[PDB]
Design a protein around this ligand. Structure first.
Ligand code: MG
Ligand code: MG
Ligand code: MG
Ligand code: MG
Ligand code: MG
Ligand code: MG
Ligand code: MG
Ligand code: MG
Ligand code: MG
Ligand code: MG
Ligand code: MG
Ligand code: MG
Ligand code: MG
Ligand code: MG
Ligand code: MG
Ligand code: MG
Ligand code: MG
Ligand code: MG
Ligand code: MG
Ligand code: MG
Ligand code: MG
Ligand code: MG
Ligand code: MG
Ligand code: MG
Ligand code: MG
Ligand code: MG
Ligand code: MG
Ligand code: MG
Ligand code: MG
Ligand code: MG
Ligand code: MG
Ligand code: MG
Ligand code: MG
Ligand code: MG
Ligand code: MG
Ligand code: MG
Ligand code: MG
Ligand code: MG
Ligand code: MG
Ligand code: MG
Ligand code: MG
Ligand code: MG
Ligand code: MG
Ligand code: MG
Ligand code: MG
Ligand code: MG
Ligand code: MG
Ligand code: MG
Ligand code: MG
Ligand code: MG
Lengths: 51, 203, 99, 193, 148
RNA sequence: UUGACCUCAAAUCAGGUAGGAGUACCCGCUGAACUUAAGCAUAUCAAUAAGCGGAGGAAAAGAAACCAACCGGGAUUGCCUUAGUAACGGCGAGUGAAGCGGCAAAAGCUCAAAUUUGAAAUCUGGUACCUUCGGUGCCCGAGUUGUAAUUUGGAGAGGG
RNA sequence: GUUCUUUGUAAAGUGCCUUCGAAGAGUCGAGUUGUUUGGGAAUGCAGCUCUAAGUGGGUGGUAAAUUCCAUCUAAAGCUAA
RNA sequence: UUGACAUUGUGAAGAGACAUAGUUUC
């Protein structure tokens, strides 16, 4: 009966994922994180719906 | 029919005809064994309103049980503990004398199933009961959509578990504010109200 | 009734166009019936009075209805049953040893 | 064992409580299980919905009586008025409650209407076997939602007849309060020899 | 987490921050609320005056609900109308067509008078009012209509 | 003399059934003290441990002698909540539930008490056959001190 | 889904009129003792003594007398989730 | 150990009351 899971306010959860999405633009972050995007066409990288 | 007559007559236990009857019968029983087969209900109107039927695979046993308090056993009255528990002698027992009645004939006829039971008499030493029983492997019973429930295993020794009418009574099984303690059955609801319920996401 | 339509006072509560339900027969679990009247009548005269009933109708004839009630209250459950028992005992008296 | 300026607490942990700790680790499992149960029952239950037409009903007590809410079942009078018997009603996915009573016409009609709508929006396949497969609408609750009845209009004329609300309350409180005492005076002054 | 905790920091000292003289022992002043009228009284009076003894009448089998009656002050009151509609009523403040506010429908049992509503007329439906709430509501040309 | 009945017996009589085990969970019985109260007896630990009888795959509970006091709800069970609250309590230490509301799941019913009386209409068993979890014929038997159909309070029954 | 027997001078549902309308006892309830409960002039359970009625009975969380009101229908019984 | 109540029924004589017919109690 140790606490295993953790409550996080839903809205704070969203703030976080919103921030996280915003950062998937911003090449230097993507670079800093590992990730070999030093020669992708552009960022955000968007691709055909055909995928 | 005559059963309505028998019913009303039976409520006049102070009446001259009935105390003659009470007095002769109660001597006769006391002469017989403490548990004995009864040939036929002696209150046929009572038996049949508790589920009895004059077909084969229905049985009546008459049984006798001592009256009075449960004297707490214990050598010489010694309790070995706190004062609140030093009683020995005004101690009363939570089951009815009729439960004892049932349970003893029930052990005497383990091939049978106790269906129900009723009071017939008493003196100062004993209460006397007739117990009505059903044979769950009699084909007469095993057929019979009305009684073959009693054939399921869930109903073994109902008398030993508090499931006859006497037992549900003493167990306190009744709806309402007066039965909060004892109703979903008391050990179980205690356990309920003393369980710590923790959620993954603590409430 | 009819409720007043406000939130305190005598017939407090919301007004509602109202209906009154068909009676439930349970609700008549008390009632007589020719059969029970007859059978109870008959058994009574088969088996006659009982000891406390016998002391009761003496008490009445010889000591009044108030001292009968007091004793009958002790004998039975309580006071409302004592009222009934004496009443009944009174009618044994009337009907029988009178007219 | 008492110190500092702290609230007095009441932590009932003086019995062998560690023997009755239920941790719901099986929250996810149960949910899944419960979901599978419903999928299963839906399938077994052919095109029938998973639930029964429940009636409208006004909730008990001063606190919730403002709101209206699903009841157990319809009442012999309701069923009758919607033109059916209860034995049949029971087989046609409708809930029937011999215990409930109608004292209230607005609720009675609401309910009868419900039964009309229900009957019109179902189809009852023939007894035989034929089975013209018809696609199951899972709920019935969702299909026939209980709504809260409109009790007025948004704007309207101001009728101020003059006599204050507060004092009507106080007086009404008052009348009640002295009702018995005035009755004793009525009685006692009636026994004017 | 344990990593941020003084007991990691006490490792190596002898007494774990509990002192050499006084020690850390099981239940020095007794357990729980022990001592209340005796060796813990100074703390109990001060911090908890009121604690021992009785006041007032017992009430057997009290059912809160009986007494359910939330308050709303004039303070708010216009809050019980959604804003789009609010401005429409605020301007064109009038008889003939004034807003009906059902304060029971909003879940309130009593209207009270904290302070100042605009001069606009309201029709206020409620179970109870405070003499002031009504006075004020009326001086704007509204009324209270008593419901249940 | 013969033949019943009632009650009571006996059989290596025909066929069956109980025991013991397991026992996490379940239905009951019986029943502590350590402990807490800074001592201690009421209280607490606890309607707990140990002891005893009895079940299942769940058990128990269950179609209201309920809850309410409302515009009333509506079998039972469980979860969230009511609430560390009403209340109990050397009113000390301590203890402590329920009604409403939301949700999981949903399901409802049968006896007794009734003249079939123009027909005991009911049933165990043996037996022969058969299409064998059973059916039919026949025969002993049960049963009127009442076995079927009909009725269960929501009703419902007899007449028209 | 198919297919074969029609069970039947069988069974059931519904509307109006009339008369009926059986409904559980050493129980309910009461005193007292004891135990238990949050349950307090007594929450349940049990022993002993008393022991009902039928427009009755139970309950309505402060004892009692009176008068009403509300609500169920006990002392028998089965039942999946 | 002592009392009351229940187990507990039947006669007869004598006391005891509606207040010198016998229901009732010792
Ligand atoms: Mg036999
Ligand atoms: Mg001991
Ligand atoms: Mg004690
Ligand atoms: Mg089963
Ligand atoms: Mg409790
Ligand atoms: Mg937390
Ligand atoms: Mg706890
Ligand atoms: Mg402890
Ligand atoms: Mg677990
Ligand atoms: Mg559902
Ligand atoms: Mg088909
Ligand atoms: Mg921490
Ligand atoms: Mg760490
Ligand atoms: Mg560190
Ligand atoms: Mg340091
Ligand atoms: Mg340092
Ligand atoms: Mg260090
Ligand atoms: Mg240091
Ligand atoms: Mg320190
Ligand atoms: Mg040290
Ligand atoms: Mg205190
Ligand atoms: Mg405010
Ligand atoms: Mg043999
Ligand atoms: Mg065994
Ligand atoms: Mg104990
Ligand atoms: Mg310990
Ligand atoms: Mg101590
Ligand atoms: Mg100590
Ligand atoms: Mg000590
Ligand atoms: Mg205790
Ligand atoms: Mg044990
Ligand atoms: Mg098994
Ligand atoms: Mg299950
Ligand atoms: Mg079961
Ligand atoms: Mg019923
Ligand atoms: Mg109601
Ligand atoms: Mg319910
Ligand atoms: Mg004190
Ligand atoms: Mg405290
Ligand atoms: Mg306790
Ligand atoms: Mg609900
Ligand atoms: Mg069923
Ligand atoms: Mg009944
Ligand atoms: Mg005990
Ligand atoms: Mg008690
Ligand atoms: Mg009273
Ligand atoms: Mg039965
Ligand atoms: Mg059951
Ligand atoms: Mg003597
Ligand atoms: Mg004897």
């Amino acid at each position: 009966w140790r606490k295993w899971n953790v409550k996080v306010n839903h809205n704070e959860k969203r703030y976080a994922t919103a921030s996280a999405i915003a950062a998937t633009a911003v090449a230097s972050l993507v670079l800093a994180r590992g990730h070999r995007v030093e020669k992708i066409p552009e960022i955000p990288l968007v691709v055909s719906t055909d995928l | 029919g005559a059963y309505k007559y028998l019913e009303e007559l039976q409520r006049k236990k102070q009446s001259d005809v009935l105390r003659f009857l009470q007095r002769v019968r109660v001597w006769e029983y006391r002469q017989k064994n403490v548990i004995h087969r009864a040939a036929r209900p002696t209150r046929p109107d009572k038996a049949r309103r508790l589920g009895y039927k004059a077909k084969q695979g229905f049985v009546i046993y008459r049984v006798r049980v001592r009256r009075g308090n449960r004297k707490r056993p214990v050598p010489k009255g010694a309790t070995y503990g706190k004062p609140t528990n030093q009683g020995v002698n005004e101690l009363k027992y939570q089951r009815s004398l009729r439960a004892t009645a049932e349970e003893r004939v029930g052990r005497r006829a383990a091939n049978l199933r106790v269906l129900n039971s009723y009071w017939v008499n008493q003196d100062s030493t004993y209460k006397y009961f007739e117990v009505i029983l059903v044979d769950p492997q009699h084909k007469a019973i095993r057929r019979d959509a009305r009684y073959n429930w009693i054939c399921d295993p869930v109903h073994k020794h109902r008398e030993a578990r508090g499931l006859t009418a006497t037992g549900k009574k003493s167990r306190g099984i009744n709806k309402g504010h007066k039965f909060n303690n004892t109703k979903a059955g008391r050990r179980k609801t205690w356990k309920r109200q003393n369980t710590l319920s923790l959620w993954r996401y603590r409430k | 009734t009819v409720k007043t339509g406000i939130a305190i006072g005598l017939n407090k509560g919301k007004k509602v166009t109202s209906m009154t339900p068909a009676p439930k027969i349970s609700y008549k679990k008390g009632a007589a019936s020719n059969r029970t009247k007859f059978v109870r009548s008959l058994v009574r005269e088969i088996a006659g009075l009982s000891p406390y009933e016998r002391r009761l109708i003496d008490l009445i004839r010889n000591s009044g209805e108030k001292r009968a009630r007091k004793v009958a209250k002790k004998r039975l459950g309580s006071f409302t049953r004592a009222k009934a028992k004496v009443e009944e005992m009174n009618n044994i008296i009337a009907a029988s040893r009178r007219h | 064992a008492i110190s500092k300026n702290l609230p007095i607490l009441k932590n009932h942990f003086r019995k062998h409580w560690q023997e009755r700790v239920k941790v719901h680790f099986d929250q996810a499992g149960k949910k899944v299980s419960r979901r599978n149960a419903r999928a299963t029952r839906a399938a077994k239950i052919a095109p029938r919905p998973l639930d029964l037409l429940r009636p409208v009903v006004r909730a008990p007590t001063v606190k919730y009586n403002r709101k209206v809410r699903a009841g157990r079942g319809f009442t012999l009078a309701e069923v009758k008025a919607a033109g059916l018997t209860a034995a049949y009603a029971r087989t046609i996915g409708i809930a029937v409650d011999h215990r409930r009573q109608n004292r209230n016409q607005e609720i009675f009609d609401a309910n009868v209407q419900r039964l009309k709508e229900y009957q019109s929006k179902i189809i009852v396949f023939p007894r035989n076997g034929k089975a013209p497969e018809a696609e199951q609408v899972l709920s019935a609750a969702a299909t026939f939602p209980i709504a809260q009845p409109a009790t007025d209009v948004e704007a309207r004329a101001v009728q101020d007849n003059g006599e204050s609300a507060f004092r009507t309350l106080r007086l009404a409180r008052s009348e009640k309060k002295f009702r018995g005492i005035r009755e004793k005076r009525a009685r006692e002054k009636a026994e004017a020899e | 987490p344990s990593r941020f905790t003084k007991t990691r920091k006490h490792r190596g000292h002898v007494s774990a921050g509990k002192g050499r003289i006084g020690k850390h022992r099981k239940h020095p002043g007794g357990r729980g609320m022990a001592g209340g009228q005796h060796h813990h009284r100074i703390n109990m009076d001060k911090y908890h005056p009121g604690y021992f003894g009785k006041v007032g009448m017992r009430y057997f089998h009290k059912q809160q609900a009986h007494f359910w009656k939330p308050v709303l002050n004039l303070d708010k009151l216009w809050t019980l109308i959604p804003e789009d509609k609010r401005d429409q009523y605020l301007k064109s403040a009038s008889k003939e067509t004034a807003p009906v506010i059902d304060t029971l429908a909003a879940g309130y049992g009593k209207i009270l008078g904290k302070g100042r509503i605009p001069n606009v007329p309201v029709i206020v439906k409620a179970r109870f009012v405070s003499k002031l709430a009504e006075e004020k509501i009326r001086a704007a040309g509204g009324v209270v209509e008593l419901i249940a």
